[PDB]
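Q: A reviewer asked whether we had any structural model of the full assembly, not just the individual parts. We don't, so I'm hoping you can provide one. Inputs are below.
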Amino acid sequence: RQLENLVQELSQSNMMLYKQLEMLTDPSVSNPRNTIDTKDYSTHRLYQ
Amino acid sequence: MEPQEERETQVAAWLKKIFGDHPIPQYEVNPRTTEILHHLSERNRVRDRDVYLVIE
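A: Here is a predicted structure for the entire assembly that you could use as a starting point for your response.
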Protein backbone atom coordinates (compact mmCIF):
# COMPACT_ATOMS: atom_id res chain seq x y z
CA ARG A 1 0.00 0.00 0.00
CA GLN A 2 2.85 2.42 0.80
CA LEU A 3 4.37 1.84 -2.64
CA GLU A 4 0.91 2.05 -4.23
CA ASN A 5 0.48 5.56 -2.80
CA LEU A 6 3.60 6.74 -4.63
CA VAL A 7 2.42 4.84 -7.72
CA GLN A 8 -0.79 6.90 -7.61
CA GLU A 9 1.17 10.14 -7.12
CA LEU A 10 3.54 9.36 -10.01
CA SER A 11 0.60 8.41 -12.24
CA GLN A 12 -1.02 11.75 -11.36
CA SER A 13 2.25 13.49 -12.28
CA ASN A 14 2.39 11.57 -15.57
CA MET A 15 -1.18 12.47 -16.52
CA MET A 16 -0.79 16.15 -15.63
CA LEU A 17 2.31 16.21 -17.84
CA TYR A 18 0.39 14.31 -20.54
CA LYS A 19 -2.33 16.96 -20.58
CA GLN A 20 0.10 19.79 -21.41
CA LEU A 21 1.57 18.34 -24.61
CA GLU A 22 -1.56 18.37 -26.78
CA MET A 23 -2.27 22.07 -26.20
CA LEU A 24 1.08 23.15 -27.68
CA THR A 25 0.74 20.82 -30.69
CA ASP A 26 -2.64 21.85 -32.12
CA PRO A 27 -2.67 22.30 -35.95
CA SER A 28 -5.20 25.13 -36.00
CA VAL A 29 -3.88 26.63 -39.25
CA SER A 30 -3.59 23.13 -40.83
CA ASN A 31 2.52 26.93 -48.31
CA PRO A 32 -0.92 27.59 -46.81
CA ARG A 33 -0.19 31.33 -46.64
CA ASN A 34 0.54 31.57 -50.37
CA THR A 35 -2.64 29.79 -51.45
CA ILE A 36 -6.16 31.14 -51.00
CA ASP A 37 -7.93 29.31 -48.18
CA THR A 38 -11.39 27.99 -48.98
CA LYS A 39 -12.42 28.77 -45.40
CA ASP A 40 -11.47 32.39 -46.08
CA TYR A 41 -14.42 32.76 -48.44
CA SER A 42 -13.98 36.55 -48.55
CA THR A 43 -10.93 36.05 -50.77
CA HIS A 44 -12.95 33.55 -52.82
CA ARG A 45 -15.73 36.11 -53.37
CA LEU A 46 -13.04 38.67 -54.23
CA TYR A 47 -11.60 36.36 -56.89
CA GLN A 48 -15.06 35.48 -58.23
CA MET B 1 -23.69 33.17 -81.51
CA GLU B 2 -27.12 33.10 -79.88
CA PRO B 3 -29.82 33.25 -82.59
CA GLN B 4 -32.80 35.59 -82.47
CA GLU B 5 -35.04 32.72 -81.33
CA GLU B 6 -32.78 31.97 -78.34
CA ARG B 7 -32.37 35.73 -77.87
CA GLU B 8 -36.14 36.23 -77.59
CA THR B 9 -36.44 33.12 -75.41
CA GLN B 10 -33.94 34.57 -72.93
CA VAL B 11 -35.72 37.95 -73.15
CA ALA B 12 -39.03 36.23 -72.33
CA ALA B 13 -37.39 34.39 -69.43
CA TRP B 14 -35.87 37.69 -68.22
CA LEU B 15 -39.18 39.60 -68.46
CA LYS B 16 -40.85 37.60 -65.68
CA LYS B 17 -37.61 37.78 -63.68
CA ILE B 18 -37.54 41.58 -63.79
CA PHE B 19 -41.22 42.59 -63.78
CA GLY B 20 -42.60 39.73 -61.69
CA ASP B 21 -45.85 41.24 -60.42
CA HIS B 22 -45.39 44.21 -62.76
CA PRO B 23 -47.22 44.01 -66.11
CA ILE B 24 -45.16 43.33 -69.22
CA PRO B 25 -45.88 45.63 -72.19
CA GLN B 26 -45.49 44.33 -75.72
CA TYR B 27 -42.42 45.07 -77.85
CA GLU B 28 -42.15 45.46 -81.61
CA VAL B 29 -40.64 42.26 -83.00
CA ASN B 30 -37.44 43.50 -84.65
CA PRO B 31 -33.78 42.46 -84.19
CA ARG B 32 -32.82 45.89 -82.78
CA THR B 33 -35.04 45.75 -79.68
CA THR B 34 -34.17 42.10 -79.08
CA GLU B 35 -30.45 42.85 -79.52
CA ILE B 36 -30.13 45.87 -77.20
CA LEU B 37 -31.66 44.39 -74.04
CA HIS B 38 -29.58 41.20 -74.34
CA HIS B 39 -26.36 42.96 -73.32
CA LEU B 40 -28.20 44.79 -70.52
CA SER B 41 -29.48 41.49 -69.11
CA GLU B 42 -26.08 39.81 -69.58
CA ARG B 43 -24.30 42.49 -67.56
CA ASN B 44 -27.17 42.81 -65.06
CA ARG B 45 -26.83 39.13 -64.12
CA VAL B 46 -23.07 39.63 -63.73
CA ARG B 47 -23.37 42.70 -61.50
CA ASP B 48 -26.18 41.16 -59.44
CA ARG B 49 -24.08 38.03 -58.84
CA ASP B 50 -21.14 40.24 -57.86
CA VAL B 51 -23.31 42.25 -55.47
CA TYR B 52 -24.62 38.96 -54.02
CA LEU B 53 -20.97 38.16 -53.31
CA VAL B 54 -20.40 41.61 -51.76
CA ILE B 55 -23.51 41.35 -49.54
CA GLU B 56 -22.60 37.86 -48.34
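A: Points you may want to mention in the reply: The interface with chain A takes residues 50, 53-54, 56 of chain B (CB under 8 Å). Chain B is about 70% helix and 0% strand.
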